[PDB]
Paper text:
Nylon hydrolase (NylC) is one of the three enzymes responsible for the endo-type degradation of the by-products of nylon-6 manufacture (cyclic and linear oligomers of 6-aminohexanoate (Ahx) with a degree of polymerization greater than three) and various aliphatic nylons (e.g., nylon-6 and nylon-66). Based on the X-ray-crystallographic structure of NylCA, we reported that four αβ heterodimers (molecules A-D) form a doughnut-shaped quaternary structure. In addition, we proposed that the nucleophilic N-terminal residue Thr267 in the β subunit functions as a catalytic residue for either autocleavage (from precursor to active enzyme) or substrate hydrolysis.
Moreover, the temperature factors (index of thermal motion in a crystallographic structure) of loop regions 1–3 in NylCp2 were significantly larger than those of the corresponding regions in the thermostable NylC-G122Y130 mutant. In the thermostable enzymes, loop 3 and η3 (in monomer A) was mutually stabilized by contacts with loop 1 and loop 4 in monomer D. We found that the V225M substitution, which was close to Gln299, decreased the expression and/or stability of NylCp2 in cells, whereas this mutation increased the stability of NylC-G122Y130 by 2 °C9.
Residue numbers in the entry:
A (entry chain B): 15 to 260, 267 to 355
B (entry chain A): 19 to 260, 267 to 355
């Protein structure tokens, strides 16, 4: 039962005219956030680094073996690099399109680690996605190549820093009006069921708001005049009656083998499920992008039955389970 | 036809970026194409240490774009529906870093403003050009910066320049692969302008309008290039059992749907000059960009026929410009 803090964390208006990267002697800081999630998923490491001067950051999922990936991108503001069907790393970052550079830092560092071998089979593949986090701060500092390299260098197996850390440093939700927008964070959750492992990582910077399982809006669209958050649809319908009278970037990593077709449909399913915890979602203003990654370690049984039903153990069932892990990650990001 | 330019076998183990103090060179290629297209500038830079490079199309006002990507090896960043620059580079996925150099320099040029409407948008695509040389140097942030800084209006360096430094064609077998280059062509028709830029690094070969294979799949043992299908069909008979990155820039207003269909049409048309094309081995990516300056007429008629003036017509004409660019790249 994730205890979301009721207190507002309004982002506030930005002070314009703020300086960019070279105005600072930028030292990457290893992000520790509010709390560390510890999880057991050998082969998967997470590094998060930030620049205090932004504040902005990058979060890197490093899977050195490489892992089959599906990408599900939705909305009118996607900022994506690579989008590969096989990745050594996923890089999530602030700084809008400029922050795709962090992924290039990861790629270059991975190349150096491979002693500059460049065989087609040895290519180090990093997919990156970004949020626009400039309205939540004054500066134009963005995650650059050095910060992506640092996030890779800071990667620790089986740890994730919750909250304001890495790409989540200046993430925010609820953008009907910026006066009601609140800082979110990044979040992760992990479930092991038998030998099945599911890790969800999310950086919600939604137009919409974060909603818990009871239907309560818990982060975003905080009206300082009422002291409460309501669902954006109330503002939108009132807006229409008045004026028309008569990004979230995320990854799900699992160890269950899925074919490319199964993996892509799993990706769509889990990403759609996030319209439960984030509302609205998959909007034209959002660049929502989910990476579904399998480390291909265990097989589903060849037939889908169990005592819980004829069609109970398949990738759809995995997607339902993973959808709940992702909701938990979204709630950790908003907590 | 032309003298061979066999790439030769790569030597493994070569030095990468960290081994050099890498000095950008403004690419001049074998000759300069000159054209008149206000608001569009092209820069190209390379590292001799590769050799490898990046070519940047800069449209400072920003321009509506459609992206058509095909094949299994796509290496793309941004892929935006509106761009201030398109960055094409070698270095496989590592060369997407050049686009970040362009993006960061455009942000500095915008005095660090970051309003949503002021975001500087760069779409980048890459070719794998490591087999065609014996170093691991790749286009890095500094080189994309240099290509932008070198950009001028109305010039394009043909041949071994920018992203085309180590491009190559005809990959049924590496012993028959030949260096290509980058290429551009331009036409103006009334007020209509069409610019095609291409960096063919195809698995297939470059074919001219007569159907002659002109670059790629050159057999030193025979002195002759072959269409890959002749090798493929014999390979099957024997054993069973026993990337091109490109842009078309025009000034004609097209809706998003029209622009997208135009991109797909021009891109498919390139299977005339590059064969095979759009294969699983290729990461073929075409950007169709319009500066939205000229309206097509409301109705499509002319003395040349009832359905003669529309986007499909523009598509057909642009397809020819792109073929000419492909041939320049192979020359
Ligand atoms: Na694996
Ligand atoms: Na260097």
């Amino acid at each position: 039962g994730i205890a979301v803090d009721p207190a507002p964390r309004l982002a506030g208006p930005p002070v314009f005219g703020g300086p960019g990267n070279d105005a600072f002697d930028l030292a990457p800081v290893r992000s520790t956030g509010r709390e560390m999630l510890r999880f057991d998923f050998p082969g998967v490491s997470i590094g998060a680094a930030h620049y205090e001067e932004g504040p902005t950051g990058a979060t890197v999922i490093h899977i050195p073996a490489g892992a089959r990936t599906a990408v599900d991108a939705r909305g009118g503001a996607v900022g994506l690099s690579g989008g590969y069907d096989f990745n050594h790393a996923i890089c999530l970052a602030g700084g809008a399109g400029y922050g795709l550079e962090a992924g290039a830092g990861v790629s270059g560092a991975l190349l150096e680690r491979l002693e500059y071998r460049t065989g087609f089979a040895e290519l180090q593949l990093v997919s990156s996605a970004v949020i626009y986090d400039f309205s939540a701060r004054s500066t134009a500092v963005y995650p650059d190549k050095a910060l992506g390299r640092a996030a890779l260098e800071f990667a620790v197996p089986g740890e994730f820093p919750q909250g304001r850390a890495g790409a989540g440093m200046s993430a925010s939700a609820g953008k009907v009006d910026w006066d009601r927008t609140e800082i979110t964070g990044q979040g992760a959750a992990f479930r092991r069921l038998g030998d099945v492992r599911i890790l969800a990582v999310v950086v919600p910077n939604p137009v919409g708001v974060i909603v818990d399982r009871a239907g309560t809006v818990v982060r975003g669209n905080y009206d300082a005049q009422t002291g409460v958050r309501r669902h954006p649809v109330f503002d939108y319908q009132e807006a229409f009656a008045e004026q028309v009278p008569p990004t979230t970037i995320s990854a799900i990593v699992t160890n269950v083998r899925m074919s490319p077709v199964e993996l892509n449909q799993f990706a769509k399913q889990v990403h759609s499920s996030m319209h439960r915890g984030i509302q609205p979602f998959h909007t034209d203003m959002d660049g929502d992008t989910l990476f579904a990654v399998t480390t291909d370690e265990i097989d589903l049984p060849t037939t889908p039955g169990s005592s819980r039903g004829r069609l109970s153990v398949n990738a759809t069932a995995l997607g339902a389970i993973a959808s709940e892990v992702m909701w938990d990650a979204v709630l950790e990001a908003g907590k």
